[PDB]
Design a protein around this ligand. Structure first.
Ligand SMILES: [Ca+2]
Ligand SMILES: [Ca+2]
Ligand SMILES: [Ca+2]
Ligand SMILES: [Ca+2]
Ligand SMILES: [Ca+2]
Ligand SMILES: [Ca+2]
Ligand SMILES: [Ca+2]
Ligand SMILES: [Ca+2]
Ligand SMILES: [Ca+2]
Ligand SMILES: [Ca+2]
Ligand SMILES: [Ca+2]
Ligand SMILES: [Ca+2]
Ligand SMILES: [Ca+2]
Ligand SMILES: [Ca+2]
Ligand SMILES: [Ca+2]
Ligand SMILES: [Ca+2]
Ligand SMILES: [Zn+2]
Ligand SMILES: [Zn+2]
Ligand SMILES: [Zn+2]
Ligand SMILES: [Zn+2]
Lengths: 326, 100, 313, 100, 326, 100, 313, 100
């Protein structure tokens, strides 16, 4: 298909916010803490709710959404999770993932807590609703689950990238598992066929936190309008010629390759600039616990060292006490 | 609103290149400084410009000034995309940017 | 020494924040996010600064503060760290651990990033200041460090407890390493003798975040006024007789036992996990080994001083 | 402000015991409900009351009403500590609490 | 649909073998070790290959297969995994999960080792083949994967039950995750639409082990022929009447309820019979490691106790030595 | 091959019930012992008989005898299923079993 | 003593089995499944029995066997356990740990299931039968136990090493607990003094599995003939001079160093994990603590015997 | 049976070093290959050879041929131990191995 990047329904780093402190073309509410790098929709405190929705409604028949996010928890269990909504009204505050219930649209829930007790979480659940069906909060929407693939998105070394595409009344969710820094490494998760959604509606994201607590960051949100090749108006008159393209792109490439060498000798010329790897950032929960045990053993080692040294001291004190008498 | 004189500003480009590259030059060609402008404002690294990068390009913070309203920002970026972008991809390439 | 819990300069859970959304008797500024059970002074976002100070100034000559906190980072490197201030003016926003520079008072910095590059971090640094010398941010206050320490307080399984005591112009910082859930398990960290501080001032805490990012949560902050046994004047005949206390406490304990039995049949009448319990057992075993070795050290010291007096004879 | 009638309130004790205790009693001796009040409002579990616990006990929402000013709460808690607490420990014990 | 249980293509306990030592109507080869309760297709030794196939070919157009199996590993990484085949030629030995390559049929692979390094394992991969395509062993069949759902089947507290249904050229794989002792608790995994398979062929199972090792047990294998309600001739004239059914089933129920009470007083009458729970059988890898560390601390505890006893002994020895001089 | 006299054998049923139930009876009705046979040979617990359970029932090991060939086993069980099982379910119920 | 390794009564990896499929100089029977690196005497299936015995009989008066094995179970309860026999006839199949009863020799049983119900299992039991004792299977050989022990050898992170030594009519069993990868870290388990065994007999190992299931792998089995320094006759002038040894060993070490450097550039020229390394570090720290406490015990014993001689004066 | 020509075999050493060592050499001194043989066939890494390691060295498949009888292997290993090993330790050292 043909994709057009729509800026009015998108936000990306590293200038996500403005001097005012709000996201352009987006309204945030709840415990959302928008920053230049990312938006923390729900922080790691108890009973947090946050949501970021679009201001103007999006009128698309075929669209594609690329959501980059992180869910980092200290424990091995998350609380509620992320939710990506294409609805008719701005949900804002509510009891479903920090968003209002009884929505008229589609929602992809990244559930990370097993309310039902079926040991099938974390999982991705696509739920459509017409606005009069209550969401089953206590059962993770098992009855309403149109398609439910199972994947782990918590505590991953790289941001999890998901792609939700509505095309010919078919919703395809393809989820990068966040194990590799490569962008275009998407893996299929789920699809729903013949689903009716409102023609125009708001794009939103939301998150919530229950007893346990996770950090629910969203790094970027991208929206692409999709059109069929046959239904795409050609209008090739605007394109002038290929001669100007050939006259321009090679000087662009030459400028890039010259600027690389221009930066090369001053990257190392000034030693103030320093790098930093992204490997020590990631550490598993079990690895952290084992490192904690190993760190705790050092007190025992040092105390035993002190005991041994004191015993050596009393031994030498008895050593010097023998020859004094005779 | 992304005028010919707006991109053709040596001081703004010199301020942006400060710190990242320690090569303060005296005078550069207009095409050279517009190449610097296009390369610098492409925050992502795709060698393309879009609405979200042009928003940070227009609503800019140097070292006071009032912030531009959202409606004016939307109108300016929509006009720029309608005028320059001919392939209807949503992104603006250097070939499309060199027209104005 | 005698200790009196001053409530006006303290906060604790689980009702730390009110319905209004502010900490009682405490003014917060910056990126501090007070919650029901803890105060996140600085979250794990980039370039965050937060501080919580007292409203009224505290006029004490001998005081003690017990701060329970957590510094949790995804990586192995901390961002900036915590800071506990006893100052003359409310710093609020600033560039020194999320608080203003040129402060008139004492500050205990829990530095977690090695700006100096000496591989001596994370560390606890006590700095006194009269308000005329700038803090050395790029060298972790090496020149201004009246007394330093070397403890790791990041990613610990249990909240890290610190106790800071100003007594007879001596400031003693004793820090629990956060390996055991026991409260009164403090280990000596640092001390400063003959330090002059303002007689009255504000108690505050603050945190900041640099390139890397940690979460700096503060669970409790308890302030006790300290007085000497001889200096405190007694008040005879004001207290009640011990007979009434003996009459009362027996019925109190009987009622609490009866309430336990009343709760027993409704806990199960109306309806931790594996793995976490094993790790808790591991940590309890390590603590038992540590206590047993400490007892062995005490016994060896006892036999050493027993033999000490046997030499001169 | 921790009055005799405020502590001797059956409906308040019943509301606080709701959920945790599934045993609605009919009538209780004043010392009984005052013991329930003292045990419930001690969150830390040290069998002691302090200024923060008293402030939580007095200024809590229940099930609209405007919040009490901080100066009034300071005055009330200071008066309570000056009256009941005789050992000058900062904490309020049931031995000291039984006076009022 | 209508299901008919076909015994010639099935094996169950607790008499899975005979006095001869072979599975009836099934031929096993490789390192398979058939027992009276399960078949260990590949044991926990290095470089094991095993396969169990049917003797006669099965001629079905719509069928259902229920496979109950266990994959138990000491470590956290599996060896190769199981493979369930419906191929027309028996492969007794080979390099693909202990079975021959270039098969003419369908194969459901329970891959438990990530050869590709994509960190997407263990996963269930459905692969069809027409006998001229080799298996991408080094990439876990990523290119040939018709449908690949992700589930964990290793070290589960209960046997993993999987159900593969071929019906109207649609292959549906529904996998019980092995967390609950309930049998009918199947959860959907994958489906493949419009796949052509040979009309008649052999049902088989196989397993293999690499440098790392797992135990690959198979507890049961059930085959049901599936027929459409309209295609199956009812022929109700062969049935006698419902009167005999009503005359028989109540005496069957009465005999059952009488035999229960008959066994009741002799279950406790003879105290030789003893029960055993199935909870201590299951233990996670991290839980086992933490238990191993806790067990290791007991040596240090005992040694410190011995040291304290010796120090007390020398203290008392110095205690009695003082008053002797004076 | 599952004859009338084969199921009507008191000694085989008594040997099977030995150990599991300590109630050695003298004489039982033919329907009672056939109920015992049907209940005992249903290893799975579904109150149903099938080919895999009938294979255990026919090829049996008591306490020598040569093992039956696979072809004879297949023929016997196929004949039994074709004769008794009328609902074409694959399983044999007690109602279907009581015919022979 | 002087220990001569006897290859005819031994097996080890990583080439334990041959192309034929049988253990060299050893006959296996039952459900034993020899492999390239280990021999699974009994797998984790229901009612498994296996044994591996020697073909030829060994005629030694003082011998030593070093057995490395693993007993791994999914559950917390063992099936039957291992057994190491020095008998007169090959037991092969049988009802006693997968070996025949009524044996004429000694048998060391690593019982892992408590048949007696005394909660004293898993335990090591040395039994010497002389041909008319039936092993008490239902009581774990409590009456026949010449000497017992109490160790846990199941589900250990490392292989369990045992050393059984017959020397001067005394049988000493020293068992590594399997917490450290070090080989020579044996701890005393049991001993029997003045026990009569046949002069020549077969060395064997066997295992069995009940309703509960365990895997009994055997990684190695090494047999050493023992002789006294005075009893062994020397052979003067047969050995070569030390000058040739000094000439040879220097070039051997130089060549192995050069081979290390040669392997260095091709290890990375032509192309453990996290978490497991942390667990290994934890176990190494535990072993270091154990060794330091043992050194402390040695030092305390030294000062105790120093004060012992100071009393009589 | 561990002959002078069997140890001094360049092709056998090259085959054993294939894969592990990516350095095909042309010609080597007899002591050099014999050192490579001794180092390669010591699997335990104790710088010692024994009857088991010698048996693996002699009877290995390579790339059909019938396996040697066990009695011949026993005789060969016994002869080697009686000839080379003088310290009666059971192990074969390079000091003892250098004789042949
Ligand atoms: Ca949920
Ligand atoms: Ca669920
Ligand atoms: Ca761009
Ligand atoms: Ca464009
Ligand atoms: Ca610092
Ligand atoms: Ca430093
Ligand atoms: Ca309290
Ligand atoms: Ca008090
Ligand atoms: Ca694989
Ligand atoms: Ca893979
Ligand atoms: Ca049945
Ligand atoms: Ca039927
Ligand atoms: Ca036993
Ligand atoms: Ca026992
Ligand atoms: Ca060796
Ligand atoms: Ca030697
Ligand atoms: Zn600028
Ligand atoms: Zn209330
Ligand atoms: Zn029978
Ligand atoms: Zn070779």
């Amino acid at each position: 298909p043909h994709r057009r990047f729509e800026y009015k329904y998108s936000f990306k780093g590293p200038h996500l916010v403005q001097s005012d402190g709000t996201v352009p073309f987006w309204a945030h509410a709840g415990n959302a803490i928008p920053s230049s790098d990312q938006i923390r929709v729900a922080p790691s405190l108890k009973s947090q709710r946050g949501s970021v929705w679009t201001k103007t409604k999006a009128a698309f028949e075929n669209w594609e959404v690329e959501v980059t996010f992180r869910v980092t928890g200290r424990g091995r269990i998350g609380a509620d999770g992320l939710a990506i909504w294409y609805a008719e009204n701005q949900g804002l505050e509510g009891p479903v993932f920090g968003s209002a219930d009884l929505w008229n649209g589609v929602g992809i829930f990244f559930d990370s807590f097993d309310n039902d007790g079926k040991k099938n979480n974390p999982a991705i659940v696509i739920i459509g609703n017409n606005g009069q069906i209550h969401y089953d909060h206590q059962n993770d929407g098992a009855s309403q689950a149109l398609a439910s693939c199972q994947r782990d998105f918590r505590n991953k070394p790289y941001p999890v990238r998901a792609k939700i595409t509505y095309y010919q009344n078919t919703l395809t969710v393809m989820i990068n598992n966040g194990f590799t820094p490569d962008k275009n490494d998407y893996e299929f998760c789920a699809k729903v066929e013949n689903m009716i959604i409102p023609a125009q509606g708001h794009f939103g994201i939301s998150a919530a936190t229950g007893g346990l607590a996770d950090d629910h960051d969203v790094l970027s949100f991208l929206t692409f309008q999709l059109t069929e090749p046959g239904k795409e108006p050609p209008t090739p008159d605007k394109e002038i010629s290929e001669k100007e393209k050939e006259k321009y792109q090679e000087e662009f490439e030459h400028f890039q390759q010259e600027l690389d060498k221009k930066k090369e000798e001053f990257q190392k010329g000034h030693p103030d600039l320093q790098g930093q790897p992204a490997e020590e950032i990631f550490e598993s929960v079990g690895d952290r616990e084992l490192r904690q045990v190993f760190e705790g053993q050092n007190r025992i080692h040092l105390e035993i060292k002190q005991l041994n040294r004191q015993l050596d001291m009393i031994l030498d004190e008895q050593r010097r006490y023998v020859s004094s008498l005779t | 609103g992304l005028d010919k004189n707006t991109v053709h500003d040596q001081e703004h480009i010199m301020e942006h290149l400060e710190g990242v590259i320690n090569k303060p030059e005296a005078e550069m060609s207009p095409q050279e400084l517009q190449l610097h402008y296009f390369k610098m404002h492409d925050y992502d690294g795709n060698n393309l410009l879009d609405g979200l990068e042009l928003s940070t390009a227009i609503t800019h913070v140097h070292k006071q000034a009032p912030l531009m309203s959202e409606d004016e920002l939307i109108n300016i970026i929509d006009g720029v995309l309608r005028d320059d972008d001919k392939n209807n991809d949503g992104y603006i390439d250097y070939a499309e940017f060199a027209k104005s």
